[PDB]
Amino acid sequence: YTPKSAGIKNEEGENLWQVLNKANMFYRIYSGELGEELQYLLKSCCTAKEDVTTLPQIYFKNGEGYD
RNA sequence: UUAAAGAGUCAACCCUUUGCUUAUCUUCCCUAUUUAAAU
């Protein structure tokens, strides 16, 4: 996700969602088969972001109590 | 218990034409008999 999903297309015309999900280069980079230069930068983007506004909330039984 | 919430509304010509048609052997055969008073 990026604001307005603008980005910049390649010379043939591709975005990251198409590039990383074409022929499984995501696992080829996450493992580190392309080096440790494209491995730290990609892992830097994997950060959590909490937001609960306008989401369903349901009670589930967990032994003695609820969650 | 993916809990809680929400107006789909409005309008319309389906019209026109038409040759179904010719022929034909259903044949042979046969034991229905046996009683009893009107309530």
Distance CA A40, CA A25 (A): 15
- Give the list of residues 6+ apart from residue A16 with CB closer than 8 angstroms, or none: A7
The separation, in Å, between residue A25 CA and nucleotide B33 C1' comes to: 105
The answer to whether the beta carbons of residues A25 and A14 sit under 8 Å apart is no
How many CA atoms, within 13 angstroms, populate the side-chain half-sphere of residue A4? 3
Show residues, CB within 7 A, near nucleic chain B.
A 54-60
Task: Scan for tokens 């043939």, then name that residue.
Answer: A12
The separation, in Å, between residue A47 CA and nucleotide B5 C1' comes to: 33
- Count of helix runs (H) and strand runs (E) in chain A: 3, 0
Resolution of the determined structure in angstroms stands at: 3.2
Method: cryo-EM
